[PDB]
Ligand binder design. Structure first.
Ligand SMILES: CCOC(=O)[C@H]1CCCN(C(=O)c2cccc3c2CCN(C(=O)/C=C/c2cc(Cl)ccc2-n2cnnn2)[C@@H]3C(=O)Nc2ccc(C(=O)O)cc2)C1
Length: 238
Protein backbone atom coordinates (compact mmCIF):
# COMPACT_ATOMS: atom_id res chain seq x y z
CA UNK A 1 0.00 0.00 0.00
CA UNK A 2 1.38 3.45 -1.09
CA UNK A 3 0.67 6.43 1.25
CA UNK A 4 -0.89 4.06 3.77
CA UNK A 5 -1.18 3.89 7.56
CA UNK A 6 -0.71 1.00 10.03
CA UNK A 7 -3.97 -0.86 10.65
CA UNK A 8 -5.25 -1.51 14.17
CA UNK A 9 -5.55 -5.23 15.19
CA UNK A 10 -9.04 -6.45 14.19
CA UNK A 11 -9.70 -3.43 11.94
CA UNK A 12 -10.09 -5.72 8.85
CA UNK A 13 -11.00 -9.15 10.30
CA UNK A 14 -11.86 -10.58 6.81
CA UNK A 15 -8.30 -9.83 5.55
CA UNK A 16 -6.08 -12.88 5.08
CA UNK A 17 -2.48 -13.42 4.05
CA UNK A 18 -2.12 -16.16 1.48
CA UNK A 19 1.37 -17.77 1.65
CA UNK A 20 3.08 -20.12 -0.78
CA UNK A 21 5.43 -22.83 0.53
CA UNK A 22 7.49 -23.33 -2.75
CA UNK A 23 10.49 -22.96 -2.98
CA UNK A 24 10.39 -21.19 0.45
CA UNK A 25 7.42 -19.92 2.53
CA UNK A 26 6.46 -16.34 1.82
CA UNK A 27 3.42 -14.05 1.46
CA UNK A 28 1.90 -14.44 -2.04
CA UNK A 29 -1.39 -12.48 -2.09
CA UNK A 30 -4.10 -10.96 0.02
CA UNK A 31 -7.57 -12.47 0.28
CA UNK A 32 -10.95 -12.04 2.03
CA UNK A 33 -13.02 -14.39 4.24
CA UNK A 34 -16.55 -14.54 2.69
CA UNK A 35 -17.84 -17.83 4.20
CA UNK A 36 -16.70 -20.35 6.83
CA UNK A 37 -14.66 -22.28 4.27
CA UNK A 38 -14.28 -19.65 1.57
CA UNK A 39 -11.58 -17.13 0.64
CA UNK A 40 -12.16 -14.71 -2.24
CA UNK A 41 -8.98 -13.56 -4.04
CA UNK A 42 -7.44 -12.81 -7.48
CA UNK A 43 -6.98 -15.49 -10.18
CA UNK A 44 -3.54 -14.05 -11.20
CA UNK A 45 -2.09 -15.07 -7.78
CA UNK A 46 -2.04 -18.72 -8.91
CA UNK A 47 0.19 -18.25 -11.97
CA UNK A 48 2.49 -21.26 -11.84
CA UNK A 49 0.75 -22.66 -8.68
CA UNK A 50 0.53 -26.36 -9.70
CA UNK A 51 -1.09 -27.59 -6.48
CA UNK A 52 -3.32 -26.26 -3.61
CA UNK A 53 -0.92 -28.28 -1.31
CA UNK A 54 1.70 -25.45 -1.38
CA UNK A 55 -0.83 -22.88 -0.03
CA UNK A 56 -1.39 -21.67 3.54
CA UNK A 57 -4.02 -19.19 4.58
CA UNK A 58 -3.50 -17.17 7.74
CA UNK A 59 -6.45 -15.27 9.30
CA UNK A 60 -6.36 -12.90 12.32
CA UNK A 61 -2.94 -11.50 11.39
CA UNK A 62 -1.87 -7.90 11.91
CA UNK A 63 1.93 -8.48 11.60
CA UNK A 64 3.67 -10.96 9.26
CA UNK A 65 6.14 -11.62 12.17
CA UNK A 66 3.17 -13.41 13.94
CA UNK A 67 3.74 -16.21 11.34
CA UNK A 68 6.32 -18.89 12.31
CA UNK A 69 6.43 -22.71 11.80
CA UNK A 70 4.21 -23.08 14.92
CA UNK A 71 1.52 -20.58 13.73
CA UNK A 72 -1.77 -22.21 12.77
CA UNK A 73 -3.17 -21.81 9.21
CA UNK A 74 -5.90 -23.20 6.92
CA UNK A 75 -4.91 -25.57 4.14
CA UNK A 76 -6.54 -25.09 0.73
CA UNK A 77 -8.59 -28.06 -0.54
CA UNK A 78 -9.44 -26.49 -3.89
CA UNK A 79 -8.50 -23.48 -6.05
CA UNK A 80 -11.48 -22.31 -8.17
CA UNK A 81 -10.48 -19.78 -10.88
CA UNK A 82 -13.17 -18.13 -13.06
CA UNK A 83 -13.05 -20.25 -16.24
CA UNK A 84 -13.14 -17.09 -18.50
CA UNK A 85 -9.95 -15.77 -16.79
CA UNK A 86 -6.94 -15.29 -19.14
CA UNK A 87 -5.23 -12.35 -17.40
CA UNK A 88 -5.82 -9.53 -14.86
CA UNK A 89 -5.92 -6.84 -17.57
CA UNK A 90 -8.74 -8.70 -19.43
CA UNK A 91 -11.00 -9.17 -16.36
CA UNK A 92 -12.52 -12.23 -14.63
CA UNK A 93 -9.64 -11.81 -12.15
CA UNK A 94 -11.42 -13.74 -9.41
CA UNK A 95 -10.73 -16.99 -7.58
CA UNK A 96 -12.11 -18.91 -4.61
CA UNK A 97 -10.15 -21.00 -2.20
CA UNK A 98 -12.10 -23.81 -0.53
CA UNK A 99 -10.43 -24.39 2.84
CA UNK A 100 -9.76 -27.91 4.23
CA UNK A 101 -11.22 -26.88 7.63
CA UNK A 102 -13.90 -24.46 8.86
CA UNK A 103 -12.94 -20.95 9.97
CA UNK A 104 -14.26 -20.26 13.48
CA UNK A 105 -15.58 -16.66 13.64
CA UNK A 106 -14.66 -14.17 16.36
CA UNK A 107 -13.46 -10.60 16.93
CA UNK A 108 -10.12 -11.60 15.27
CA UNK A 109 -11.67 -13.19 12.09
CA UNK A 110 -15.08 -12.91 10.49
CA UNK A 111 -16.48 -12.70 6.91
CA UNK A 112 -17.11 -9.52 4.89
CA UNK A 113 -20.57 -9.12 3.23
CA UNK A 114 -20.75 -9.38 -0.54
CA UNK A 115 -22.36 -6.30 -2.17
CA UNK A 116 -26.08 -6.50 -2.94
CA UNK A 117 -27.23 -6.70 -6.62
CA UNK A 118 -29.83 -4.06 -5.62
CA UNK A 119 -26.97 -1.85 -4.34
CA UNK A 120 -25.24 -2.00 -7.83
CA UNK A 121 -26.51 1.64 -8.34
CA UNK A 122 -25.36 2.99 -4.86
CA UNK A 123 -22.33 5.35 -4.49
CA UNK A 124 -19.68 4.24 -1.96
CA UNK A 125 -17.92 7.20 -0.30
CA UNK A 126 -15.93 5.33 2.40
CA UNK A 127 -13.63 2.79 0.60
CA UNK A 128 -10.34 1.33 1.87
CA UNK A 129 -7.61 -0.79 0.29
CA UNK A 130 -5.56 -2.97 2.66
CA UNK A 131 -2.52 -5.21 2.44
CA UNK A 132 1.09 -6.11 3.35
CA UNK A 133 2.33 -5.00 -0.10
CA UNK A 134 5.07 -2.53 -1.10
CA UNK A 135 4.98 1.19 -0.17
CA UNK A 136 6.54 2.03 -3.65
CA UNK A 137 7.58 0.06 -6.79
CA UNK A 138 11.05 -0.72 -5.46
CA UNK A 139 10.23 -1.95 -1.96
CA UNK A 140 9.39 -5.13 -0.02
CA UNK A 141 6.48 -6.91 1.74
CA UNK A 142 5.56 -4.95 4.90
CA UNK A 143 5.32 -6.51 8.39
CA UNK A 144 2.17 -4.56 9.51
CA UNK A 145 -1.15 -4.62 7.59
CA UNK A 146 -1.47 -1.17 5.88
CA UNK A 147 -4.69 0.70 4.96
CA UNK A 148 -5.51 3.60 2.61
CA UNK A 149 -8.85 5.41 2.00
CA UNK A 150 -9.26 5.85 -1.75
CA UNK A 151 -12.15 7.31 -3.80
CA UNK A 152 -13.91 5.16 -6.42
CA UNK A 153 -13.49 6.32 -10.02
CA UNK A 154 -16.19 6.10 -12.77
CA UNK A 155 -15.68 3.59 -15.63
CA UNK A 156 -15.66 6.55 -18.10
CA UNK A 157 -12.90 8.32 -16.16
CA UNK A 158 -10.95 5.02 -15.64
CA UNK A 159 -11.14 4.22 -19.38
CA UNK A 160 -9.64 7.71 -20.20
CA UNK A 161 -6.72 6.83 -17.84
CA UNK A 162 -6.10 3.46 -19.58
CA UNK A 163 -5.88 4.17 -23.32
CA UNK A 164 -5.10 0.85 -24.94
CA UNK A 165 -7.04 -1.25 -22.37
CA UNK A 166 -10.74 -2.10 -22.36
CA UNK A 167 -12.10 -1.05 -18.90
CA UNK A 168 -15.33 -3.07 -18.53
CA UNK A 169 -18.20 -2.80 -16.02
CA UNK A 170 -16.81 -6.05 -14.45
CA UNK A 171 -13.85 -3.83 -13.31
CA UNK A 172 -14.03 -1.00 -10.77
CA UNK A 173 -11.33 1.65 -10.42
CA UNK A 174 -10.09 3.68 -7.47
CA UNK A 175 -7.52 6.34 -6.62
CA UNK A 176 -6.92 10.11 -6.39
CA UNK A 177 -6.44 11.97 -9.74
CA UNK A 178 -3.08 13.17 -8.33
CA UNK A 179 -2.00 9.71 -7.05
CA UNK A 180 -0.26 9.03 -3.73
CA UNK A 181 -2.60 6.41 -2.15
CA UNK A 182 -3.15 2.93 -3.70
CA UNK A 183 -2.30 -0.75 -3.89
CA UNK A 184 1.17 -1.95 -4.84
CA UNK A 185 3.08 -5.29 -5.25
CA UNK A 186 1.81 -7.90 -2.78
CA UNK A 187 -1.56 -6.26 -2.13
CA UNK A 188 -3.30 -8.08 -5.05
CA UNK A 189 -6.11 -10.48 -4.19
CA UNK A 190 -6.92 -8.41 -1.14
CA UNK A 191 -10.13 -6.45 -0.55
CA UNK A 192 -11.34 -2.98 -1.50
CA UNK A 193 -13.79 -2.61 1.51
CA UNK A 194 -16.56 0.03 1.49
CA UNK A 195 -18.70 1.01 4.49
CA UNK A 196 -22.36 1.62 3.57
CA UNK A 197 -25.20 2.00 6.17
CA UNK A 198 -22.73 0.97 8.95
CA UNK A 199 -21.94 -2.34 7.08
CA UNK A 200 -18.70 -3.17 5.28
CA UNK A 201 -19.06 -4.67 1.79
CA UNK A 202 -16.49 -6.38 -0.41
CA UNK A 203 -16.72 -3.97 -3.33
CA UNK A 204 -13.52 -5.04 -5.11
CA UNK A 205 -10.53 -7.39 -5.33
CA UNK A 206 -7.14 -5.63 -5.81
CA UNK A 207 -6.14 -6.59 -9.35
CA UNK A 208 -3.87 -4.43 -11.53
CA UNK A 209 -2.62 -0.91 -12.45
CA UNK A 210 0.20 0.89 -14.28
CA UNK A 211 2.80 1.43 -11.52
CA UNK A 212 1.77 2.11 -7.88
CA UNK A 213 -0.45 5.14 -6.96
CA UNK A 214 0.70 7.19 -9.98
CA UNK A 215 -1.11 10.38 -10.98
CA UNK A 216 -4.08 9.54 -13.29
CA UNK A 217 -3.41 5.75 -13.06
CA UNK A 218 -6.11 4.45 -10.69
CA UNK A 219 -5.94 0.92 -9.29
CA UNK A 220 -8.15 -1.57 -11.18
CA UNK A 221 -10.21 -3.94 -9.04
CA UNK A 222 -12.51 -6.91 -9.84
CA UNK A 223 -16.04 -5.46 -9.44
CA UNK A 224 -17.39 -8.01 -6.97
CA UNK A 225 -21.10 -6.99 -7.42
CA UNK A 226 -20.80 -8.40 -11.02
CA UNK A 227 -19.66 -11.81 -9.66
CA UNK A 228 -22.12 -12.46 -6.80
CA UNK A 229 -23.99 -15.09 -8.91
CA UNK A 230 -20.68 -16.76 -9.91
CA UNK A 231 -19.62 -16.80 -6.17
CA UNK A 232 -23.02 -18.26 -5.15
CA UNK A 233 -22.77 -20.88 -7.95
CA UNK A 234 -19.41 -22.11 -6.70
CA UNK A 235 -20.10 -21.85 -2.91
CA UNK A 236 -23.80 -23.00 -2.84
CA UNK A 237 -23.44 -25.96 -5.23
CA UNK A 238 -25.96 -28.73 -4.37
C1 LIG B 1 2.73 -5.76 -10.94
C2 LIG B 1 2.28 -6.27 -12.27
O1 LIG B 1 3.25 -7.27 -12.72
C3 LIG B 1 2.90 -8.12 -13.70
O2 LIG B 1 1.85 -8.09 -14.28
C4 LIG B 1 4.00 -9.13 -13.98
C5 LIG B 1 5.23 -8.97 -13.06
C6 LIG B 1 5.01 -9.55 -11.67
C7 LIG B 1 4.44 -10.96 -11.75
N1 LIG B 1 3.23 -11.00 -12.58
C8 LIG B 1 2.02 -11.45 -12.18
O3 LIG B 1 1.08 -11.57 -12.94
C9 LIG B 1 1.77 -11.64 -10.71
C10 LIG B 1 1.69 -12.94 -10.19
C11 LIG B 1 1.37 -13.12 -8.85
C12 LIG B 1 1.15 -12.03 -8.02
C13 LIG B 1 1.26 -10.74 -8.52
C14 LIG B 1 1.54 -10.53 -9.87
C15 LIG B 1 1.50 -9.13 -10.44
C16 LIG B 1 0.36 -8.35 -9.82
N2 LIG B 1 0.50 -8.31 -8.36
C17 LIG B 1 0.13 -7.20 -7.54
O4 LIG B 1 0.39 -7.23 -6.34
C18 LIG B 1 -0.54 -6.05 -8.19
C19 LIG B 1 -0.55 -4.85 -7.64
C20 LIG B 1 -1.26 -3.66 -8.11
C21 LIG B 1 -2.65 -3.61 -7.92
C22 LIG B 1 -3.34 -2.46 -8.22
CL1 LIG B 1 -5.05 -2.38 -7.89
C23 LIG B 1 -2.71 -1.35 -8.75
C24 LIG B 1 -1.34 -1.41 -8.98
C25 LIG B 1 -0.61 -2.55 -8.67
N3 LIG B 1 0.73 -2.67 -9.16
C26 LIG B 1 1.32 -2.20 -10.26
N4 LIG B 1 2.60 -2.45 -10.21
N5 LIG B 1 2.81 -3.05 -9.01
N6 LIG B 1 1.69 -3.19 -8.37
C27 LIG B 1 1.09 -9.49 -7.67
C28 LIG B 1 2.48 -9.18 -7.10
O5 LIG B 1 3.31 -8.56 -7.76
N7 LIG B 1 2.72 -9.75 -5.90
C29 LIG B 1 3.93 -9.75 -5.17
C30 LIG B 1 5.07 -9.06 -5.57
C31 LIG B 1 6.24 -9.18 -4.85
C32 LIG B 1 6.32 -10.01 -3.73
C33 LIG B 1 7.59 -10.10 -2.95
O6 LIG B 1 7.66 -11.00 -2.00
O7 LIG B 1 8.48 -9.27 -3.11
C34 LIG B 1 5.16 -10.67 -3.32
C35 LIG B 1 3.98 -10.55 -4.03
C36 LIG B 1 3.48 -10.57 -13.96
Amino acid sequence: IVGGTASVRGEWPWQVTLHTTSPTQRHLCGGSIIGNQWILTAAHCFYGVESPKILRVYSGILNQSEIKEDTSFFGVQEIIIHDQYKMAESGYDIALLKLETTVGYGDSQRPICLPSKGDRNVIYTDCWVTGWGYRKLRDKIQNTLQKAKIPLVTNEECQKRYRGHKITHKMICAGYREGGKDACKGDSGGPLSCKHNEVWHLVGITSWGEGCAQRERPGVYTNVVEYVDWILEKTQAV
